[model samples]
Target: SNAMVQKRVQVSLKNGLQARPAALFVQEANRFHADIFIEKDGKTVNAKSIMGIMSLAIGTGSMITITTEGSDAEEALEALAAYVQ
Candidate 1:
C-alpha cells in the first residue's frame, strides 16, 4: 500500500499532565487510525501511547510532529492536531 502521508505540527503540553494524559493522547491517535511521534535528542518516538510518549516526558515548550501513513492519514493528522492541542 502507498504511504498515506505525514504532516508536522507544533504544540505545547498542558501543565501537570501526568501519565494518564499521555495515554489520552494515544487514545486520540487510535481514534484517527494514526500514529503519533515526537522528536528529541535526535531521536523520534511514537507519541500515541502514554508509555511511549511519557518515556520522553515531553514537558512545556516541547515541539512534536505527528506522522500518519495510512488510508486516513490526512484525516488522522487533522483530528490529532486538535486532540494534541
Candidate 2:
C-alpha cells in the first residue's frame, strides 16, 4: 500500500519552471517511485511530465500543491519539499 500525502508549497524557482527548471523538476519527480502530481488552482497534471509542467507556466512563489503516494512517501514528499521550499 502507498502512503498518500499532499502539501501546498511556494514556488522557489526564479522563473518558476521555465524550461530548464521544468526539465529538472520532471527529472526529480521521476527519481522517486511515488506517484506524483502537481495541482495549481484546480489544474492538475503529472509531476513527472515536463510537458505538463511546462504548459502550466506556474509563476514564481506561487502556491502549488504536491500530491504523491508511495511506499516511501515520507522521504519522497520531503524530497519535493526541499525542492520547492
Candidate 3:
C-alpha cells in the first residue's frame, strides 16, 4: 500500500542551470504525488513549475527547500536530494 511520507532538505542551485531541464525535478515529484517548494533569499517558490522556478534565476548559494508528501515521499525526497546535489 502507498503510504505518505515527508522530508525537508536544503540545497543550493549550481551555476549554469536552466529551467528546461529543471522540470525533471517536478516530474519526479509528480511521480509520487508530492509537492516541491523552493526557498531562496527568504522567498519561497513552487517547484512544480519549470518556468516559475527558472524565473528565479537562482545563483549559487541559494538555499532551496523541498516539501514532499505522498506514498513515496521519503524515497522521493531522498532521490531528489541526490538530484540536487
Candidate 4:
C-alpha cells in the first residue's frame, strides 16, 4: 500500500564514496522529487545531503540500500542505484 521503493546495491567504485562521488550522488539525487535515503550499517541518511552521505564513510565494494518514496520513487531509485553499482 506504499509507493516506497528500495534496493540494495553493491558499490564497484574504486574509492567507494569519496567527496566527489558523494557530490555526484547528491547532485543526481536532487533531480527527483522523491524522498531518497541511503542505508549503511544500520544507519540511514538523506541521499540529497552530501554531508550525511560522507559521514557514512562507505568503502569500496560496500553494499548499501537505497530507499525512495514518492511519485517518482522508481526513477529516483534507478538513478541512484546505478550510481553506486
Candidate 5:
C-alpha cells in the first residue's frame, strides 16, 4: 500500500509565502509522484496549484501543514520541509 506522510513547517522567509516563494513551492511540489495538500488556518488546498497555495496568504512565522500520499510521499514531504526554509 502507498503510504502517506505529513509535516508541519513554519515560514521564516522575509517575504513569507509571497509571489516568488509560492510559485517556487508549487513548482517543487509538482516534481514528485504524489498527491499533495497544504493546510493552514483550517483550510486545505492542493499543493501543486499555484493559485491554491497563494490563496493561503501565509506570512512570516506562519505554520502550515503538508500532506502527501503515493509512491513518493515521504520524499515529497522531506523535500518540501527542506525547501521552505
Candidate 6:
C-alpha cells in the first residue's frame, strides 16, 4: 500500500525551518510510517534526521519540496504540511 507523493511549500515563519523548528519537524516526521525527504536548492535530505534537516540552512521564504513514500505517505505529507505551514 505504498505510494509516492510530492509537495512544494515556502517557509513562512520568521525563523524559517531552522534550529527548533527543524528539530520539531524531524521529531514529527519520525512518527509516521513513511519515508520522508525534503529538498531545497537541488539538495535533498532525510526529513527524520536532525542533522539532515539542519544542513539545509532553510530560511524565511525558502522554497522546499517534500516527497514521501510508504503506506501512510499521504497522511505523513498532510501532517507535515500543516506543521510547517
Looking at candidate 6, the ten consecutive residues that score lowest on lDDT are: 1-10
- Per-residue alpha-carbon lDDT of candidate 6 for residues 1-85, written as tens digits (9 for 90 to 100): 5468989988786788887888789999999999999999999999999898888998989999999999899999988887777
Question: What TM value does model 6 have?
Answer: 0.93
Q: After superposition, how far is residue 22 of candidate 1 from its true place, in Å?
A: 1.2
Per-prediction tally of clashes: 2, 0, 0, 0, 0, 0
Residue pairs with colliding backbones in model 3 are none
Runs of candidate 6 exceeding 4 Å displacement: none
What TM-score goes with each of the models? 0.70, 0.89, 0.64, 0.94, 0.92, 0.93
Whole-model Cα lDDT of every candidate shown, in order = 0.63, 0.82, 0.60, 0.90, 0.87, 0.89
* Cα lDDT tens digits for candidate 1, 1-85: 6574555555555742245666776777777655545655456776566666666666666666667776677787777666656
Tell me which of candidates 2 and 4 scores higher on TM-score: 4
The prediction achieving the highest lDDT against the true structure is 4
Candidate 1: which stretches are off by over 4 Å? 1-4, 16-18
Instruction: Report the C-alpha displacement of residue 69, candidate 3, in angstroms.
Output: 2.2
- Deviating ranges (above 4 Å) for candidate 2: none
- Which residue ranges in model 5 land beyond 4 Å of their true spot? none
Model 3 over residues 1-85: C-alpha lDDT tens digits? 5343434444455652255347776676556656656655566666667676777666555455655666566676777776665
Sort every candidate by TM-score, greatest first.
4, 6, 5, 2, 1, 3
* Model 2 pairs whose backbones collide: none
Model 5 scores what on Cα lDDT?
Answer: 0.87
Answer with 2 or 6, whichever has the higher lDDT.
Answer: 6
